Amino acid sequence: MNMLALTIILPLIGFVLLAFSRGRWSENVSAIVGVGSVGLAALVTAFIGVDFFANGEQTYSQPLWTWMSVGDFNIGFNLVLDGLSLTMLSVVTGVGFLIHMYASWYMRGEEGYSRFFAYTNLFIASMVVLVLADNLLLMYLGWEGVGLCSYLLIGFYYTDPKNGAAAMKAFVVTRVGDVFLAFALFILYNELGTLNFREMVELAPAHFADGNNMLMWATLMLLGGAVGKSAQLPLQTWLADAMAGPTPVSALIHAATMVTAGVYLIARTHGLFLMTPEVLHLVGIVGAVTLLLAGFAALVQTDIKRVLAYSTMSQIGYMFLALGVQAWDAAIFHLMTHAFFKALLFLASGSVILACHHEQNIFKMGGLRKSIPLVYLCFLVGGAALSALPLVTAGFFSKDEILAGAMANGHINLMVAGLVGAFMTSLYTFRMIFIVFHGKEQIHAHAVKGVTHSLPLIVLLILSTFVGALIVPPLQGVLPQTTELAHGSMLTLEITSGVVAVVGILLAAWLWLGKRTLVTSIANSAPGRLLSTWWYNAWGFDWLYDKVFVKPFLGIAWLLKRDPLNSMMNIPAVLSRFAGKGLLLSENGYLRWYVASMSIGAVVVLALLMVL
Amino acid sequence: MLLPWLILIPFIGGFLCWQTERFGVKVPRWIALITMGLTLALSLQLWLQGGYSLTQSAGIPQWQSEFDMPWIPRFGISIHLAIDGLSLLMVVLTGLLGVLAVLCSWKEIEKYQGFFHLNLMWILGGVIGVFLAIDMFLFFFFWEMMLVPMYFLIALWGHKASDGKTRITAATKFFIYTQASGLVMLIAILALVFVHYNATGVWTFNYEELLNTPMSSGVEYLLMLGFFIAFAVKMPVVPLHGWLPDAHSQAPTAGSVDLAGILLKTAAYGLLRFSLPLFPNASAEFAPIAMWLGVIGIFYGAWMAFAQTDIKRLIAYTSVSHMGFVLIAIYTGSQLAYQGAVIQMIAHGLSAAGLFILCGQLYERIHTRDMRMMGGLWSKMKWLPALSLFFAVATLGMPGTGNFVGEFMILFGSFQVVPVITVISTFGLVFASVYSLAMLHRAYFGKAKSQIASQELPGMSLRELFMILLLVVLLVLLGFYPQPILDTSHSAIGNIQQWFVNSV
């Protein structure tokens, strides 16, 4: 109710204060203002959410000012708050509030403090802009707004250059996706004139009576934009390297904020993807092949942050399938559950790595149940939901609904993909906690007790469970394509996923409960290391994407260390100076040759006159 | 009416600063600030008082104010000053850049300082005269006399006669590369007037009657190449741009503000105003060569920017990448593309001026020019690198800056007219990011132990921060709210495009 810009201005304005109070403020006042910006954002979001319930799920639009206006090119700062956008706002202004409230305690004790609460507010503000935008332009401001903020937070620690160098590969890769995204934007203005989503929805079939061949180029290249920003095969590079930053920024980037931009673009243009069915099924095709890639790389390396990261890649592509199977509201339901567990799962790991005191390993710790069971119950709750366990979990309803929709689509390969994904999620569910928290503690992890993080831990504990699954997100305000329902086989698919999850959990527990010598043998077997090296390269994709253009780019830069065309158009000066030196040497000073010059001028003048 | 006065205040101020040099030495700084204030007052008065939102289809001749005066009556050479809408944007930009030039030269007393400022006002007044020029000879005379006083700036003030590298390479290439092509376009002017004199029978040097002169095909093409050569050595185009990095890396950064922010404007001004309307079919034939040179310029400037190790040559090689978008914009048949070029062009000046002021500011803080020698100065400087981060951010297409809307409406209009050369062109944004981050990481990110001299750093005065704060806030308003100046330029851009469309 005329309060949409307060979900953008109040964070953004707070950033400006912390961008110029470069450490001159104290700890406490900086901490309060940084959390209070996002806190006011959540409160204003809640007011418009309960008023949206009082609106009868009727959308509310607010134009602030027209951005630019040429007589055929009309772009305005239009904000649309409908059911899909309200849910995507709900995730951000809750999760960013919870993640940032933890950062009020995690950040203290070290420098770069006002700096970090400056760039987090900008990061949040850019994500709110993307999901409330009504024009594809303003939404483009959202895409590279949040990309620059990921650069400022991945490379947050500027002292050592590993994390200071890891951010630019993400920056290069996200701008390749943004070029791919803007390509479809040019094509949509050339073909359909107006970039507003709804006016586009009932203008697309009116303009398309004759020619359709070029719309696949628009939509396929639009798809290339959506996939790159979050995670997918053609551009899956940077999510391992994004873990080099601090724990709270990894949660913000990987859990529900920046990675939930590629989901919002496919979901918002769902009618636009319904104008072409094969580009819609192609999302699921690429989704089905990335669940096969993104899973077991969590098992391979000994970095906990790389574990949580390959799981996020697997889950985002799991969504792309869910959107490719024409189950839109179910996918956002998966997102509503997915934000809760991932953020806590990431955050709890940070608290324990504070207690680890520079371990960064999964094979040298054990018996951590006796250290502190609070983090033990944190991983436990997250693991159950991820594995699709039927015991008081939140997300299992979302997996059950999308597989029901997927088998209502009727693609046996997609259920095979879904079945192997459920088995693969259950494999890396408890293997991490069994290899880390169980064994012997030769290096003590000193647990830290404090109410400042315990209260959000309890809030995240009560939210990530099935109590949070009862909060139905607003999906009746957009009226999307209806997610089809199947009955009778719902119980059959539910028990099938439960058996698959239980078998995977029991196999991980059997890997734990064994001697682990067979695990050591397959971690020492030469074909095992070949596959480990092959999936260190991750189907050679980072290998291919470096060695396809990078050293050619460095080679042409090494060929451009001196500027060629400046030199090759200096040859007039070179020829003139050298020819001038020759003419100076042609002069002698001996007066006989001066008179010979006079005779030889007379000879040539008479000759040149006699040829005329 | 106001136009004779508005081109003469720079010359009057140079006379008075040099007159009062005998009276005092602290006078010309304070004289120069007020005189440029009067220049912007008349320029802003024309913006507000004039009908900037005028008729979009009032023909090719349309001017808010116009001056005529007989200068050499034997050829009809007249002082035909006449101001259009887009010309008025150019005048207000150079008045603001003149204020920055005279503010950066504050607290700079030498053996002679009145000589520096009479030269400073002379070169800025020359650019104003090019911007208000409809008679061809007046345009050419002003084009060539703003080019002589910068030579004295690079020579006697590049360094005070200690090293010979500030004259014999930098300043001399600057002078020759421009003047040979200036003489080329002069004989182009004369060939056009002679074919008009055969057609009608009057010796005229005026733009309105030379606009529609009848010329046979295969003749005006050579004159269009003759105009474009002089218009391609002033703004950096692919074959002839070797003068630009040498000129910017040796002149004082106030002279570099003149050399980058406003001397690069006049060539694309002339491509919009004097080359496109006079030669419609020649430009229609020459268009694809212009598109190929434009895409080559963007990619080439970014690679040479990535490969360079110093800072003045670094920003000097950003400029050649930026102007490729403008050249492709001009050589297309789209109104939106031209209006994108204008906002990109004003933002180009505003995004190069702040960087050059700050690069010169950093050098006089640390007394070291090489970028890779320093690193990690963020813990030492308190306001320089934060403001410098946004200017490097404003260089590429970051929204909320004017450069994004500029380059990106060109791309809309460019894809409207021709697909394949535009889809190549867009990739310069990725390359814009890599040299932008290279500048940022090599200079400011790192450890201060990279250089011994990075351990004792001075403070920053109030007036430099004031003139940096004004540019960053001015550039943000142009990025967020570019409507007022687009409504100003609509009619001038529209009639040029309508003539380029209808005359073919």
From Swiss-Prot, chain B:
> Subunit structure, per the record?
Composed of 13 different subunits. Subunits NuoA, H, J, K, L, M, N constitute the membrane sector of the complex.
Bilayer topology reads: Multi-pass membrane protein
List the keywords (alphabetical).
Cell inner membrane, Cell membrane, Membrane, NAD, Quinone, Translocase, Transmembrane, Transmembrane helix, Ubiquinone
In the record, biological process GO terms are: aerobic respiration; ATP synthesis coupled electron transport; electron transport coupled proton transport; respiratory electron transport chain
Family label: Belongs to the complex I subunit 4 family.
Reaction(s) catalysed by this chain's protein = a quinone + NADH + 5 H(+)(in) = a quinol + NAD(+) + 4 H(+)(out)
Q: Which GO MF term does the entry hold, naming one? A: ubiquinone binding
Topological domain, Cytoplasmic: which ranges?
Answer: 22-29, 104-121, 195-221, 280-285, 335-339, 447-464
InterPro entries in alphabetical order: NADH_Q_OxRdtase_chainM/4, NADH_UbQ_OxRdtase, ND/Mrp_TM
Record's function text: NDH-1 shuttles electrons from NADH, via FMN and iron-sulfur (Fe-S) centers, to quinones in the respiratory chain. The immediate electron acceptor for the enzyme in this species is believed to be ubiquinone. Couples the redox reaction to proton translocation (for every two electrons transferred, four hydrogen ions are translocated across the cytoplasmic membrane), and thus conserves the redox energy in a proton gradient.
Q: Where in the cell is it found?
A: Cell inner membrane
* Protein's name according to its UniProt entry: NADH-quinone oxidoreductase subunit M
What is the species listed in this Swiss-Prot or TrEMBL entry?
Escherichia coli (strain K12)
Query: What are the annotated GO cellular component locations?
Result: membrane; NADH dehydrogenase complex; plasma membrane; respiratory chain complex I
Mapped to this chain, the residue ranges on the Periplasmic side of the membrane are 51-82, 143-173, 243-258, 307-313, 361-382, 425, 486-504
Q: What is its EC number?
A: 7.1.1.-
For this UniProt entry, which segments traverse the membrane? 1-21, 30-50, 83-103, 122-142, 174-194, 222-242, 259-279, 286-306, 314-334, 340-360, 383-403, 404-424, 426-446, 465-485
